[PDB]
Design a protein around this ligand. Structure first.
Ligand SMILES: [Mg+2]
Ligand SMILES: [Mg+2]
Ligand SMILES: [Mg+2]
Ligand SMILES: [Zn+2]
Lengths: 102, 46, 71, 99, 56, 212
RNA sequence: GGAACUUUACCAGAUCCGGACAGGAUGAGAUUGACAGAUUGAGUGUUCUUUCUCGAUUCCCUGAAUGGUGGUGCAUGGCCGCUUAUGGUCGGUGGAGUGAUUUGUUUGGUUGAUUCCGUCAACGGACGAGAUCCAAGCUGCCCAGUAGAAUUCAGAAUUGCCCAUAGGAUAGCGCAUUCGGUCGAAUUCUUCUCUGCGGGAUUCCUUUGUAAUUGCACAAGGUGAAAUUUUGGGCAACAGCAGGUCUGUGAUGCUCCUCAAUGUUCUGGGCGACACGCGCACUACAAUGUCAGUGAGAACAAGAAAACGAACCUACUUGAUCAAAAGAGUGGGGAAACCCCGGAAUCACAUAGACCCACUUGGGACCGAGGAUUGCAAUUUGGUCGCGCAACGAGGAAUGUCUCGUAGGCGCAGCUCAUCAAACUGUGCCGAUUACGUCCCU
């Protein structure tokens, strides 16, 4: 009837996968309807800068990339059950957001 | 570098301003500034 | 340029010495054995080791090879 | 304007005693914001930098700088002078000193 | 008078002068992408801490 | 409204760089080896990894409360939403960031560069590291500047595996003659626990399991 | 390093001290700020006249201090470039030397490879190479209300005889096609798509190949999505270099300036001034073209704000009872959600379109008049009408880069960025010739 979305975002692929697996395991233990863990497209932030600090020599460039991993989990559970599912140790560098879908 | 070659001046050296001392000005004085918070020196009100 | 680096050759020779009755003439079964019998961070090296182990076994069938001593 | 009024100066001094350390962004414009027993009081950052330059030259405080921000902390002799300057009761110690 | 004249152009928010690096306050070669506001030379050293890595 | 996902991580990285630089400058005198933070709804809970945790704490938590005040004032943290913790590094000689600081102190103590670097290398080797490298560059022997490097053990300098198997740190020592650069690279031995070392086998090595 | 101001470091001025601190001379008048009038480029207390106001914060002069895009990169740190794209590099212990030094690290084959194989006064090592790494292919699990599909019930639209202008060619022969607004319902599923871990390629297989006459390999073909470092990157030893940077930094040593300042602010001008020479771009010289229609069609991306929303990006409407460029309004998007079903430009067109070999409807240099828009400032940038009679008809001696989704052609995004890309960093589109060699040159 009422559906709630968990959004897990991180820079660390291993950390976000571990948190998503932990949330899935908790949801399965709680026996709630789960609309799968959806892997949203990974987003790459790219910045290219000159390698030199002075402008001398061959114009060599440096490319830095930062990857963003996002997962969403849809479940039918009230606020107390969702809070009990989400309350555990978590990991650093990842964040989980609660939303209510209408 | 930025050599201090000095500068010739076409004008005289303007003097440093000094506050005028009014000894016992309170004794000498007179209108109180009408401005609520406050020519009125505080509000420069003329 | 498909020469087997000394790391690959030494690992394959050690594999042949340690497991000889457990190997074969094909590449895929040898590689399947290699995955369990060796620990490595890479799969390209495992494939190369399996290929050179198959080559070593084919040579060993015809005659003894230098660097490998089967007790 | 580095000319700092006495009320703002002693308000900053009271904040610097209450909280053992004080941080201010190095910016000639802008206003530094602090809290003294609730509410909020602001004073331009340049006057604060001048005051704590004076304190550092008098060896009152220890100064650190990183990423366009200052960090001024009070030593034992620094806290002592602050109690004397504000004529604060003896045995009064900064929040960091209080266990 | 002179208080009003002091830094009157700097009070205007527009211009390269207003924007400066958040680590060194230098108004040259500023990376404004993703609102980073960091000079390229400082970004080269602080890239790892921010989260950027050298790949391909 | 809310900030975008690609902007929140940028803000978090900038904040982490700010905190790392501030902690480095503040605790340069002590031997500090890292900082982490785990934000939650209740609390931020910043943790520091150092060697001289006694001096980082101070008496009755004086220095730790001072640092908490610093960070709170800098980042506008609400009262009670931020805490600071300090943990001793498990192995002092396996941390390049602590070893460079120690070597910088030895240099500033008017000690000979060769003796100080050799002592640093000896301590690192005793700590169990696979290899150590120490570079000192500047006006050591007079007006003309030179660079001297002292090495021991293994040291890989190629590929991306070195960015994980080797920890490095660089500091600038200021002396009456001028600025001297000191760099310390350490090859971390592999440990299955993962607290120290990569916890994975080297890309080069291939190990064959002994038959049963 | 695309400079209107700022930036800006330069020039002509004019403010402020942002000289802390200590010691003096003061002093609850130490001081601060000022309306007006004139000073001035300044309705700049800048200084004065003039009185007010502020109040121990500050003045005064003595050392000191401080800042500097002052100097010196031939004092340095750090970083970068280069040597140096190739296969290089260094211990130990033993051997050889009176010694510097040498051997290992040799020659033969093999290889991009100090890559392996064989040999061996060396024997053991360490580093580079390779490995690792990150993207492109092909595929497994997962996965969808930020992604799709196929059905079924409706609602609808065309519906047969139909022969252009002169009207060719180019599939169809239980059940005719269509209709992202018909904003239709229902049901199912994952062909495409998303993506964290997997797999897959190893010379693996085959030559009465080559070589071998141990090997290490190699050439063809096979298998395959991919067949040789699979492909493109990243990383990269050890020595160097008086290479660049003291204009990135609260990187700095030594010096220089320091209150009519080499500090700092503000005003005006410069950084863009021309006879010229040179580097690198962009647009041309037309017909395999230029105009004017129609059609079909990508990818990479970016979007709003401190100490309730508002700035940012958008769609749609309107302006519109009448050019563009505008300008409004209304929604949406924090970005797999909006833009977006991303209508890119190359390109196509049997468009029965214009031109017809000319410096011409080729080519837009350059300039005139109007109007918009960015901006504090336009003496920026679009858009409209003139100008084109500016060269240029394919470029001497010279000289760059490049081997397959490549060259070349074509757009698009990000970036700097109020405004302004002939730039760069990416990205897709269309797509060749040649070679598959060699040491002639370097
Ligand atoms: Mg020079
Ligand atoms: Mg030179
Ligand atoms: Mg440019
Ligand atoms: Zn910077």
């Amino acid at each position: 009837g009422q559906t709630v979305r968990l959004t897990i975002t991180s820079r660390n692929a291993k950390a976000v996968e571990s948190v998503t697996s932990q949330l899935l395991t908790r949801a399965r233990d709680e026996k709630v309807t789960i609309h799968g863990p959806v892997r949203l497209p990974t987003r790459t932030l790219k910045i290219t800068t000159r390698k030199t600090p002075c402008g001398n020599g061959t114009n060599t460039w440096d490319t830095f990339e930062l990857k963003i991993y996002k997962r969403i989990i849809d479940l039918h559970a009230p606020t107390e059950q969702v809070k009990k599912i989400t309350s555990f140790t978590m990991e650093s560098g990842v964040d989980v957001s609660i939303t209510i879908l209408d | 570098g930025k050599k201090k070659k000095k500068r010739i001046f076409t004008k005289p050296k303007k003097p440093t301003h000094r506050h005028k001392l009014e000894k016992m000005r309170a004794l000498k004085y007179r209108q109180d500034c009408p401005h609520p918070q406050c020519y009125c020196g505080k509000c420069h009100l003329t | 340029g498909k020469i087997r680096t000394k790391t690959v050759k030494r690992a394959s020779r050690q594999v042949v010495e340690k497991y000889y009755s457990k190997l074969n003439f094909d590449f895929y079964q040898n590689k399947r054995v290699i995955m369990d019998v060796t620990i490595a961070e890479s799969k390209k090296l495992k494939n190369k080791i399996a290929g050179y182990t198959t080559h070593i076994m084919k040579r060993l069938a015809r005659g003894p090879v230098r660097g490998i001593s089967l007790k | 304007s580095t000319y700092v009024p006495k009320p703002s100066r002693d308000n900053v001094y009271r904040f610097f005693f209450t909280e053992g350390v004080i941080a201010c962004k190095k910016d000639r414009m802008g206003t530094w914001t602090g809290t003294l027993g609730g509410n909020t009081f602001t004073v331009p950052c340049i006057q604060v930098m001048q005051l704590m330059r004076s304190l550092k030259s008098r060896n009152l405080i220890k100064e650190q700088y990183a990423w366009r921000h200052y960090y001024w902390t009070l030593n034992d002799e620094g806290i002592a002078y602050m109690r004397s300057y504000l004529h604060l009761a003896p045995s009064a110690m900064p929040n960091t000193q209080k266990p | 008078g002179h208080l009003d004249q002091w830094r009157s152009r700097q009070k205007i928010g527009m211009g390269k002068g207003a924007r400066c690096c958040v680590i060194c306050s230098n108004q040259k070669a500023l990376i404004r992408k993703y609102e980073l506001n960091v000079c390229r030379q400082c970004f080269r050293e602080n890239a790892e801490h921010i989260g950027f890595t050298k790949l391909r | 409204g809310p900030l975008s996902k690609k902007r929140m991580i940028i803000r978090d990285g900038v904040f982490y760089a700010e905190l790392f630089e501030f902690l480095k400058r503040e605790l340069a005198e002590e031997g500090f080896s890292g900082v982490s933070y785990h934000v939650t709804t209740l609390r931020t809970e910043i943790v520091i990894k150092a060697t001289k945790t006694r001096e980082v704490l101070g008496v009755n938590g004086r220095r730790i409360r001072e640092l908490t005040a610093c960070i709170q004032q800098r980042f506008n943290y609400k009262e009670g939403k931020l805490q600071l913790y300090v943990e001793r590094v498990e192995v002092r000689g396996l941390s390049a960031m602590a070893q460079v600081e120690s070597l910088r102190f030895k240099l500033l103590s008017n000690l000979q560069v060769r003796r100080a670097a050799m002592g640093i290398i000896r301590y690192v080797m005793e700590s169990g590291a696979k290899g150590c490298e120490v570079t000192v560059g500047g006006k050591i022997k007079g007006q003309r500047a030179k660079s001297m490097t002292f090495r021991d053990g293994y040291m890989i300098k190629s590929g991306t595996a070195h960015k994980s198997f080797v920890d490095s740190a660089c500091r600038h020592c200021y002396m009456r003659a001028g600025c001297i650069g000191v760099k310390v690279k350490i090859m971390l031995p592999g440990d299955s626990t993962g607290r120290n070392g990569p916890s994975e086998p080297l890309p080069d090595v291939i190990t064959v399991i002994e038959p049963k």
